[PDB]
């Protein structure tokens, strides 16, 4: 009917509204048909989904440490003893250019190697930003308009640890839990659909915040 | 008065003083741009060169009257600076109120102005 | 009376690596005072305008000489909205001091990307195109979370904001990074009678606050 | 808000030989009291009016009386100037106390003396030939030299100046000497707009200050 008392406050937080793990990316490693790659390299996007985005975007600055759970399986979601490599590239390193290229073998990029058959790899990145913060809105230019490269988180590059072809396809989920979160000035929540990944382009036809109603003085829409 | 004053001396120095006047109605509302510009350059072509030097920007519906001080003037046997007053903004006014006024300026010496070399005069 | 942003007094950066091996450049009165824009004539048609800061003063007075001929700047800004309306005039205006106001294009349902002349609009100032969504794609309605004054035309004619610097770094670039933009918006529409003056003026003016400079060309 | 000419307030004469062996006649409230001269009708066209002192209360009430039937006189003034205009009214009127305002003629380039209407013009007072220079050949721009008051319509309708009594005798006729001449000039014209009230009233209130009489007839 009526909840008489108030819910507290912890939820209501930014350190718990910008928690808990979510799907970031789904990373396919194509080794059969006419893809017979063996290996991707994804590029860590914290604004993959526009669910993700929107929430990000009510802050203007934010620093965070970004916790990585990669979730493998294959098409029929078995999960067999094959073993994976997964390499961190840090903002600013040589990504891999073939499923043998020397860049698996750079000691400084950090690498997972798990078998499908493990429970999932995980791993925490740092704060990885030259400034003191992540700015998801930069009004100038580097030197295109508002992108800032300072935002570069890095790049996972996965392969399978084979010599030739495997003929199966690696399915893997990234799950990203933001940690130790602080956000700086507040912003409003996106209204309108985005139009394309790093601006904040909107289409002319604007929709209005607000449903319509048939008349300023009825209640019933 | 300090302008007939002067005519009798050869040497004067100091600052001066000048205070405008707006006579508008009550309701009439709007901002000029006084702008003093030093004896070395000449007249400011816009009012965005004039907003660079020493300037006051004066509101009719706020001060009825501003008073601007020119730090120093002189004179022997000009070197003088300019003033030039600016439409900052439009002149606003509400129906059936005038659209035109006037503003009244008047000129004195301040107290450390001084006189040298007692010389007749060319008025009379 | 006078909105301090995110209640945080405009002050000078505490000691800096880069800046104890060479002392940044704080100039007085000289470069702190007050520039007074081009009038904006508010008519009833009008949309609202917005400016980039430092971008506004850029081109402007010795702050500009400054802001051009040095690499890094930093410094605060005291920002006056003043209107000169008469008591027969009506109408609402929301001053909204906006950080990282980055401009979004409108494609037709392809310009995706802003140009050069909305981005750094100058001392000039830009119109906005579609106030509804700020140019920018969020809503109007909630650019009250941002520090704003109203400038209701029957209780007030004017508005003071004052924004410290706000950056993920201690200095940066004057000439290619806008720290905020400043925009005056239109909410209630201008209304006046036949014989009234037919637009309000709207004076932009600002005293940038604590100024630093850095590496000097 | 009162100017006190030459910050002198008007006060009794010191003892005098002539008046040691007679003393004069100090009258209170009954002379000492408030007159309110007609009103004058400021017009868009006007040029502005003078009154002669104490020639203006000559022939009004018990003043009146004292003036004519004394042979000696002295005493200051209090007078008031007040207009009665709207906020829609706009115009600036100088009000100078003028001692010893002698009124020139003006000659065709041949009257080259004032008449009687002109010198004494009563208690209706007279209307200014050429304000310019005031009708004696003298600036008006200088005239701020005498004490004086602005009537600025937006500002303030009412003036008040305190004029203790000048003159290098210590006593004089007031039938055949007028000590000061008020004038109201105005500078900046009266404008209105149509629907207003086409002229703006001007009252002038006088208060004798320590009026005396000597050698009652």
Redesign the interface.
Known sequence: RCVMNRNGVNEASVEHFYSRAGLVGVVEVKDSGTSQDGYTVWPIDVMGFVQQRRKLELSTYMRFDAEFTFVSNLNDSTTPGMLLQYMYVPPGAPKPDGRKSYQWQTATNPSIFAKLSDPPPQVSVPFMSPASAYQWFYDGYPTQYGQCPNNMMGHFAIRTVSESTTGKNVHVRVYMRIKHVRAWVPRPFRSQAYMVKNYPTYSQTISNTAADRASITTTDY | ?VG?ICRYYTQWSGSLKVTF???????????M?IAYTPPGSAQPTT??AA??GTHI?W?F?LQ?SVTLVIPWISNTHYATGIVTIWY???????????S???I?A?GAAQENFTLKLCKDTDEI | NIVLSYGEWPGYCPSTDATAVDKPTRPDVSVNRFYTLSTKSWKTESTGWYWKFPDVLNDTGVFGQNAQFHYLYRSGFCMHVQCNASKFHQGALLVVVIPEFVVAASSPAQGLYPDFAHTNPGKEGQVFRDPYVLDAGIPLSQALVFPHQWINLRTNNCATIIMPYVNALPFDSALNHSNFGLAVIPISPLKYCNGATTEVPITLTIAPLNSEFSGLR
């Open positions: 008065m007939q006047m707006f006579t508008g109605s009550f309701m009439a509302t709007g901002k741009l009012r965005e907003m660079l920007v509101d519906g009825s900052q903004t439009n002149f606003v006014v509400p129906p059936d109120t005038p035109e006024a006037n009244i008047l």
